[PDB]
Amino acid sequence: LSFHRVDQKEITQLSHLGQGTRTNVYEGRLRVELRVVLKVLDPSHHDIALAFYETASLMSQVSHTHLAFVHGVCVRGPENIMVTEYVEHGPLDVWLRRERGHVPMAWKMVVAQQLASALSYLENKNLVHGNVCGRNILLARLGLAEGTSPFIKLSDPGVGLGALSREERVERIPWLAPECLPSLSTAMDKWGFGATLLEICFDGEAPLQSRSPSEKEHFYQRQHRLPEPSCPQLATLTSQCLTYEPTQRPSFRTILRDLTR
Ligand SMILES: NC(=O)Nc1sc(-c2ccc(F)cc2)cc1C(N)=O
Ligand SMILES: [Ca+2]
């Protein structure tokens, strides 16, 4: 396990941004003053803290234009804090819901290509993200003004999927791949991408949102098909990604090629 150790003296904790899986998220400063995000892990069992370090270790060996940077881990008393990139306009799901009306199809396709390019890179390195969702897509540039285009960053997955409870995996439906509800393959990120595409198509509203945890579980148990976008070309892709059999999902090379044409 390889990650930088950040001394508590080098960080300043600012305002609460919200909550992640077993975390409290804050804006912060990192003395080098760099604007950062601090993911403070709740007091937890060693297994959860080990899964949290494993994410920081995974994020430290990769580099990509559309992957949010991890500066390291800070231990402040009994708290584990991952120090991460501050991305200006924040999570995409929140932005899309707040942003009046819908964004253009062309804007949505750029975000989709950028995310597919990041996942293509992890696929080639044989590395699992395991938490692909609108909440984990961060908006660096709005790209709404003439001549401009959006710029996203896929954030770290947080506490690894292997350490979470069945309740947390259920809360993760429909982003969570169905084989993960009861192995850790890159196939799971093709499902997460497919569910993120729908979530973006539906302006930050994810399918099965209003449903209860037993309804979500039953939906995957009865292997019901997720909704499709109106565009037949996009419909083919999202249904191909959102295939229950993981070996039938397309590679990110194919997904990226399909998205560009
Ligand atoms: N690197 C990284 O993940 N940065 C994050 S996470 C986050 C957030 C997380 C959970 C919430 F409930 C609300 C906001 C914001 C930002 C940011 N602005 O960069
Ligand atoms: Ca909107």
JSON list of C-alpha atoms and ligand atoms in Angstrom, two decimals, residues 17-19 25 37 39 68 84-87 90-91 135 138 155, ligand 1:
[
{"chain": "A", "resi": 17, "resn": "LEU", "atom": "CA", "xyz": [-19.90, 20.12, 2.03]},
{"chain": "A", "resi": 18, "resn": "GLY", "atom": "CA", "xyz": [-21.95, 17.05, 2.87]},
{"chain": "A", "resi": 19, "resn": "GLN", "atom": "CA", "xyz": [-21.72, 13.33, 3.54]},
{"chain": "A", "resi": 25, "resn": "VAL", "atom": "CA", "xyz": [-16.79, 15.98, 3.46]},
{"chain": "A", "resi": 37, "resn": "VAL", "atom": "CA", "xyz": [-11.46, 18.53, -0.17]},
{"chain": "A", "resi": 39, "resn": "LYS", "atom": "CA", "xyz": [-12.96, 13.28, 3.48]},
{"chain": "A", "resi": 68, "resn": "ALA", "atom": "CA", "xyz": [-9.63, 13.80, -9.36]},
{"chain": "A", "resi": 84, "resn": "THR", "atom": "CA", "xyz": [-8.36, 15.28, -2.39]},
{"chain": "A", "resi": 85, "resn": "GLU", "atom": "CA", "xyz": [-8.73, 17.74, -5.28]},
{"chain": "A", "resi": 86, "resn": "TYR", "atom": "CA", "xyz": [-11.26, 20.55, -4.92]},
{"chain": "A", "resi": 87, "resn": "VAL", "atom": "CA", "xyz": [-13.20, 20.61, -8.24]},
{"chain": "A", "resi": 90, "resn": "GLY", "atom": "CA", "xyz": [-18.94, 20.17, -7.38]},
{"chain": "A", "resi": 91, "resn": "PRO", "atom": "CA", "xyz": [-20.99, 16.94, -7.93]},
{"chain": "A", "resi": 135, "resn": "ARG", "atom": "CA", "xyz": [-22.36, 12.16, -7.22]},
{"chain": "A", "resi": 138, "resn": "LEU", "atom": "CA", "xyz": [-17.25, 16.58, -10.44]},
{"chain": "A", "resi": 155, "resn": "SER", "atom": "CA", "xyz": [-13.54, 11.33, -7.89]},
{"chain": "B", "resi": 1, "resn": "LIG", "atom": "N1", "xyz": [-12.33, 15.27, -4.86]},
{"chain": "B", "resi": 1, "resn": "LIG", "atom": "C1", "xyz": [-13.61, 15.25, -4.46]},
{"chain": "B", "resi": 1, "resn": "LIG", "atom": "O1", "xyz": [-14.26, 14.21, -4.29]},
{"chain": "B", "resi": 1, "resn": "LIG", "atom": "N2", "xyz": [-14.21, 16.50, -4.29]},
{"chain": "B", "resi": 1, "resn": "LIG", "atom": "C2", "xyz": [-15.50, 16.78, -3.88]},
{"chain": "B", "resi": 1, "resn": "LIG", "atom": "S1", "xyz": [-16.51, 15.64, -3.05]},
{"chain": "B", "resi": 1, "resn": "LIG", "atom": "C3", "xyz": [-17.77, 16.82, -2.85]},
{"chain": "B", "resi": 1, "resn": "LIG", "atom": "C4", "xyz": [-19.02, 16.48, -2.16]},
{"chain": "B", "resi": 1, "resn": "LIG", "atom": "C5", "xyz": [-19.21, 15.21, -1.63]},
{"chain": "B", "resi": 1, "resn": "LIG", "atom": "C6", "xyz": [-20.39, 14.87, -0.99]},
{"chain": "B", "resi": 1, "resn": "LIG", "atom": "C7", "xyz": [-21.37, 15.82, -0.90]},
{"chain": "B", "resi": 1, "resn": "LIG", "atom": "F1", "xyz": [-22.51, 15.51, -0.23]},
{"chain": "B", "resi": 1, "resn": "LIG", "atom": "C8", "xyz": [-21.24, 17.08, -1.43]},
{"chain": "B", "resi": 1, "resn": "LIG", "atom": "C9", "xyz": [-20.05, 17.41, -2.06]},
{"chain": "B", "resi": 1, "resn": "LIG", "atom": "C10", "xyz": [-17.40, 18.01, -3.40]},
{"chain": "B", "resi": 1, "resn": "LIG", "atom": "C11", "xyz": [-16.12, 17.99, -4.00]},
{"chain": "B", "resi": 1, "resn": "LIG", "atom": "C12", "xyz": [-15.49, 19.11, -4.75]},
{"chain": "B", "resi": 1, "resn": "LIG", "atom": "N3", "xyz": [-16.16, 20.25, -4.80]},
{"chain": "B", "resi": 1, "resn": "LIG", "atom": "O2", "xyz": [-14.41, 18.95, -5.30]}
]
